[PDB]
Amino acid sequence: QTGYKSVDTMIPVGRGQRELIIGDRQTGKTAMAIDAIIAQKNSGIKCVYVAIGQKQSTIANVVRKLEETGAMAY
Amino acid sequence: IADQAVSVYASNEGYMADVEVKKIVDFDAALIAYFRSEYAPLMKQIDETGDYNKDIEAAIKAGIESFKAT
Amino acid sequence: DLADAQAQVKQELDAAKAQAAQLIEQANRRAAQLIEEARTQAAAEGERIRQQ
Amino acid sequence: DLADAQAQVKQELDAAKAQAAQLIEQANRRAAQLIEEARTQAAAEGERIRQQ
Ligand SMILES: Nc1ncnc2c1ncn2[C@@H]1O[C@H](COP(=O)(O)OP(=O)(O)OP(=O)(O)O)[C@@H](O)[C@H]1O
Ligand SMILES: [Mg+2]
Numbered sequence: 001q002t003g004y005k006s007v008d009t010m011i012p013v014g015r016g017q018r019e020l021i022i023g024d025r026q027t028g029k030t031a032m033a034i035d036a037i038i039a040q041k042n043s044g045i046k047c048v049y050v051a052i053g054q055k056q057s058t059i060a061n062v063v064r065k066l067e068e069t070g071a072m073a074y
Numbered sequence: 075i076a077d078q079a080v081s082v083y084a085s086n087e088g089y090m091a092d093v094e095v096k097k098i099v100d101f102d103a104a105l106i107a108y109f110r111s112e113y114a115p116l117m118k119q120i121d122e123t124g125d126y127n128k129d130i131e132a133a134i135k136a137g138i139e140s141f142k143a144t
Numbered sequence: 145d146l147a148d149a150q151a152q153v154k155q156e157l158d159a160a161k162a163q164a165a166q167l168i169e170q171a172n173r174r175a176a177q178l179i180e181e182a183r184t185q186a187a188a189e190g191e192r193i194r195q196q
Numbered sequence: 197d198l199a200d201a202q203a204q205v206k207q208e209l210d211a212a213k214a215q216a217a218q219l220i221e222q223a224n225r226r227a228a229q230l231i232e233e234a235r236t237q238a239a240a241e242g243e244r245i246r247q248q
Contacts, residue, residue, distance in 0.1 A: 004078075008078060009082065067196065070192065104174075107177075108174075111174070111177060144170055152203075153199070153203050156207060157203070160207050164213060167214050168217055172221075174221075178228075179228050182232060183232075186235065189236075193239055193240075194242075
């Protein structure tokens with residue numbers, strides 16, 4: 001579950017599927033994955049993400065959001 | 075799950091082609107409030123399972139009429 | 145017809161009062177529950193902050 | 197016939213009162229969330245005191 005209406009309904013995504021996300025700059029590409037992760041809080045599934053060549057500011061933003069959610073424990 | 079569930083139910087039932095264009099989302103959120111307040115056991119039961127039964131949708135449309143009254 | 149007209153005037157007046165009552169009670173209950181849940185949420189957020 | 201119309205106007209008029217109630221709810225929710233943010237920053241100041 002992605003915590004969405006648009007996503008979860010029209011584009012199903014199950015466990016183990018690979019699914020690219022594609023878009024432009026500042027158009028909402030990560031925020032989506034982040035929401036999906038936060039959804040998995042109750043599920044208790046294994047969730048892990050990799051930062052790849054981006055600004056440490058963005059990094060710490062993601063971090064602070066995660067620990068705010070307390071998600072950064074599973 | 076019940077959130078989008080009732081939303082799509084209303085859409086397919088044409089329960090949205092009747093109300094105000096802009097007020098669509100407001101109606102949606104207030105519907106969520108309406109139900110999760112009154113029907114909290116109902117949506118609890120349905121989202122704990124992921125299975126649908128016809129009596130469930132009967133309760134859904136009952137809530138539909140009650141909230142459309144509000 | 146005049147007698148019937150006054151009768152139906154009162155009949156609709158009572159319905160208008162009843163519906164106004166129903167609306168004012170329902171909306172107020174919904175708003176109060178809104179406020180209750182908001183307070184609970186932000187309180188829990190505060191304790192989580194302090195745990196941080 | 198004139199008597200028949202006025203009743204409808206009163207009924208239509210109730211709608212205005214219903215709309216008015218909504219303004220009350222909106223103002224009150226704005227006040228509630230402003231209070232929420234104020235006590236949020238207050239918790240921030242308490243955490244700052246913890247920092248000293
Ligand atoms: N549902 C939403 N409603 C409103 N704004 C949103 C929503 N989802 C995401 N955004 C906004 O989209 C903006 C741009 O997305 P974001 O900066 O988080 O990453 P990005 O799209 O991957 O871009 P970048 O190339 O910089 O990595 C964000 O500032 C975020 O606030
Ligand atoms: Mg990005």
